[PDB]
Design a protein around this nucleic acid. Sequence first.
RNA 1: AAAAAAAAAAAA
Lengths: 145, 94, 68, 277, 48, 48, 98, 248, 148, 193
Amino acid sequence: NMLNLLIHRKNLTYLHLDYNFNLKPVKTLTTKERKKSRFGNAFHLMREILRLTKLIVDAQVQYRLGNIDAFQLADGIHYAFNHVGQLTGMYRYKYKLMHQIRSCKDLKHLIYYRFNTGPVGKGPGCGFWAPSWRVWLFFMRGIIP
Amino acid sequence: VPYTGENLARPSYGPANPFKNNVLTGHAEEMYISEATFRAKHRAVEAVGGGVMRSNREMKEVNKRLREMREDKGSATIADGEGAYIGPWARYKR
Amino acid sequence: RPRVITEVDSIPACEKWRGQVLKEISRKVSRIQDPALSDYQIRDLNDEINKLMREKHMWEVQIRNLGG
Amino acid sequence: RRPARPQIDPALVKSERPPQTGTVFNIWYNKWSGGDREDKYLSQTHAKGRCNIARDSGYTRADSRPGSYFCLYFARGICPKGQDCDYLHRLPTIHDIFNPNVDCFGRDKFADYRDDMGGVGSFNRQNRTIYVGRIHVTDDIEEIVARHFAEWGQIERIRVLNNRGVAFITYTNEANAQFAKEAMAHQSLDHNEILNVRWATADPNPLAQKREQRRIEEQAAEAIRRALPAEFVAEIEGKDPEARKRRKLESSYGLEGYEAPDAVHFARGPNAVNPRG
Amino acid sequence: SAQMGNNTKKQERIIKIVERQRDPMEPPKFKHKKIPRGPPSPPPPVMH
Amino acid sequence: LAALQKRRELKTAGINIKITTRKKGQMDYNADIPFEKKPAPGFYDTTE
Amino acid sequence: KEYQGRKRREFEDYIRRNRLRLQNWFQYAQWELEQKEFARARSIFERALDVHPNNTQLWIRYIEAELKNRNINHARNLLDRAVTRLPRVSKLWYKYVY
Amino acid sequence: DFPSVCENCLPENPYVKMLKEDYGAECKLCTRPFTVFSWAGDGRAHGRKKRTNICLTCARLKNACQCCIMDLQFGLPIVIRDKALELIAPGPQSEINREYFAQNNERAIEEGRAKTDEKARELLRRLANSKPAALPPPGPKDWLPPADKSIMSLFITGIEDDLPEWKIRDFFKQYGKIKSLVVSHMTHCAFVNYETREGAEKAATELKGRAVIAGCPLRIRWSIPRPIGTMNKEERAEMLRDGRSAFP
Amino acid sequence: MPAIRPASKRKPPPDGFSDIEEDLLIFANKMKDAQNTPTDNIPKHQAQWPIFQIAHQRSRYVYELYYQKQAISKQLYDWLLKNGYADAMLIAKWKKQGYEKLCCLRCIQTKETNFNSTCICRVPRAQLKEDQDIQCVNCGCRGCASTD
Amino acid sequence: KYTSDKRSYLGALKFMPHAVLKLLENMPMPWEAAREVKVLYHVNGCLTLVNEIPRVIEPVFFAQWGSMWRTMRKEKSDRRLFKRMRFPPFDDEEPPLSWSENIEDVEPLEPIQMELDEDEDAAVYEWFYDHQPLIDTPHVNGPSYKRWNLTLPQMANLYRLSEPLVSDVVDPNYFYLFELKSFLTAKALNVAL
RNA sequence: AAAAAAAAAAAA
Ligand SMILES: [Zn+2]
Ligand SMILES: [Zn+2]
Ligand SMILES: [Zn+2]
Ligand SMILES: [Zn+2]
């Protein structure tokens, strides 16, 4: 609602923000409209952080509705914290964040190579999400000021 | 000096003008009083009953008539229907 | 706009028709004010201005008959 | 007595969006956007209620509180609360005067008017004149205007510029003028029309100009006469010959041929030399 | 003091002035206006 | 010029159409003296 | 009034565009003198004196413009100000005695 | 750090609880942000939070209370005082010139630079010397009721510009219920339309073709209601003379 | 725990809960109905009044079932206070001298008013004017002084 | 009706990063079906800040995630075919789900929990999967949840449950020339161990 | 002993 109010106060009502925090033009934009509607790194960074938060919250909502069970919830949370560069365009507005992405990838490798040993076959199912969740909390600690 | 009594006692010479205030409407100065003094004087002016000499028993009597003018408070152990608890949201009859 | 000016009795429709006729008359006067207009062009502009004035007069007559 | 009558039922009174004049509803400005600008202001619709003072008046939860303003929506005929409204639901009387910062409904008055001259109004003109137009042009305009522009207050002067369908109603009270403007806007007189009751500008007629200038002058004179003592002002005009004789005899103070100046004689204070006050 | 006509001595007042509680979330309320520069101080005599 | 002749022509034909050139970001030079700097008084009285 | 507003707008835009050229102030003040707006012309000349305090030509033209409209006491105050500000310019003293 | 508020805007309680907000609003004259002082009026438990509506500099320029915006010497509106006393109004009222003058003069306005008294006496003296074939007298047929029962209007001629509509309305309210009263001071004409013919008959009976309202002589007749249009100055003058001739 | 447990990790309530369970669901359904009450006709602050009223009513039901009638056990009372069936701080004020009929906690938060006052509904009715039907902007209280 | 809120609402955008972090730091663990958190909320509805710090007992947190490691490995071995959830979970044009009409009293599914033995895991059995374990017992300082003390059977049980994620290194001599000082020394000499 | 926006696509 804050992002929508900021869009509507600036009279950019030809931009639609959908509920997964994607900003798309509803029509074909002129040069003047494209120059007026070009948001900056603060708006877009905040939008992408809200998108990641929405993905996490929506995973918990899908668990609470009954559509997915707890193992699917944990695997989805671990997938989401490991695929911020794929599920968000968050890196486009703060590129040092790539470090965090790399960190999660490194953790994933270690976790995955200790998780699939013996009868535990490959595929989805690893819900050990705590290290990547830590990494993005420390990212938020840095990014708040 | 110039705070002694003989300095404050002497007047200003000369005649008086036949034809000052800090702000445009009057004179206002910063003052220091206790919070309780301002609250008590504001209460004495504000409360309808500031003054009018009255002891505890007839004040309780006035409270009793005021309470019986109001609606029934209800029973708090009755959760539904007539007799349900209304409480401080009971209005005064008029 | 409707062809039957006298049949129009609505005040807002007559006012809108009169405003459109006035805008057309102003556009015709602005076109006639252009020096590029030749004798045929000036005659066409004068005829358009006269037609717009007649339409505005009919709309105003209908308005004065039925509100305005 | 009589409680305030609920005008419109709450089932018909909601808080919904305006009719769709665009593609996207702007929620910051609460206005439709998109479409074409040929729509723009479009037209002024017909309002959802009129007022009967003899039928809709009563008491609210405002007669108990001194200083309560009148109700805008009771003046608009669409107030559903009735006796539970926090504002007055009666007609403004002649003693219902207000300061030059608010109207009779409590809305703040502005420095200057708006170009589309309506709204609350400005405090830089004590405007008791309401401009009504969009009247169905007939021959009996004056009678129906005097019948229907009469239940809102006490009226000084209605000049009906007939043929144009325009009238200028001047009430004796500014609060009554504001009440009439907020009550008759988008109403019907005899046929289905939308009245454009707006704030009147200034009558260029020099007779009206000198009337307004004079009325301003005796209003200020009334204020000055309230300020000054009765003997002082009675000497000030000097229409009474006895007051003139009192001025000649009193403004001597021993020295003959003085005729003391008005700064010295008409002076108020503890140290003045006069009966003072 | 005395004002608006009447000259009766009104009782003196004790006024409690408290800062108003402001919403912590409220942005700055008013825009900044670019007003042109005022005239300088009156220039001195030229003592050549 | 053409606006002037069309305004005069419509002025002759009864109606008084209001002319407005009040763009946004525009100052009013006819309301009051723009940035009024009154002359400094001297030893000579100039009220007459 | 439309002509007056357009001329005032043009003159003020020239003044805002280049205030360090005396011709803009001179033209605006002379034009406002022509419609007998003496307070406006005085304000324009005093604003020019705020931009150009020690210009002898501006002082001379403003004293002359005050004199040619028979404002004697205004112009004598102006000459007092001019010989106060620039006591070493003999042109102002010579005009003042003349 | 303290507002300039008159006594009638202040609460009746001698002890005032006041809120203060730095840059709480823009001044209603110069549109500059200013410290707003606010208090609760004597209308306890509902009403309006009274506040300083204009800044202190504009209150020095206008000599007015910050809340009510009326003159602090006579209790008059600022424009009423200025029109009736011909005052200078010391300050520009344009858009940018307001901030320019306030930016360049806020230290001299505070010290009372940049007292009417005598001009009030001048206004009082000026209002002391204020200076604001004839038809036969009416015969019996003017106030006798006509045979047509549909005739309802009462025509009044001789109305001056000083007579308001309300004086006529409550002068004729004592005779019955008035459906309509049209007073045109431009043409000195008036039409009274009652609801019952008995009231109009009583008005004709106890008026007898003549009337005096607030010292103004008027002539009353029976009339079928006809409109008043664009009408000649000579005809207006002759029925004004006729209305004066109602009292010979 | 106020946090929901599925079915097999839920612990049963203490004994005597099933006697008052119907009235507890009456209060719960009253609050759920108070969630869906139109705000279109009333001021914004008036939209929140029934929730404070129902919270007061449910807390008062628990409070006078334990302290006046003593029809519920102490363990059941602490379980009701711990599981959100009654407001423990409002009950704590109700056991004090002078706050026995207090409408809600926010009406005695003196640090959060303009002039460090309580609410006007805390005032005894005798010191208020006649025909003054005050109605608290916090909760709609019409006077909650103990003498009232 | 809410125009008077709008500016304030937009201003709280300035403080939405803390809220996100606060929410993201107080997310329920896989062994909790639901969690209650304390929130500080604006009275106009513009900003909800989770007013909690997720304090845990570190041996308990280690044992709980070790039991998670066991349970997810066993389930990924036992399940016929693990179906990954779809990201994003909801469509872009689907409106946000109301709490009252969609989640509020809905039966939660059972969370990931290792089935403890009633006799072997007797020291932790009744409190192992609580949100704040032993908060009402004298094993903690109080409801502010800041200090813990545990008995020998409890610490033994927590250590046994932590063996997937606990170090087996006892000798510090294991870390000869593989510690922070040697890494910094090798960084100074531009060499790699 | 193992490194992943802008220029630049133009004022009824
Ligand atoms: Zn005042
Ligand atoms: Zn309360
Ligand atoms: Zn309260
Ligand atoms: Zn209360």
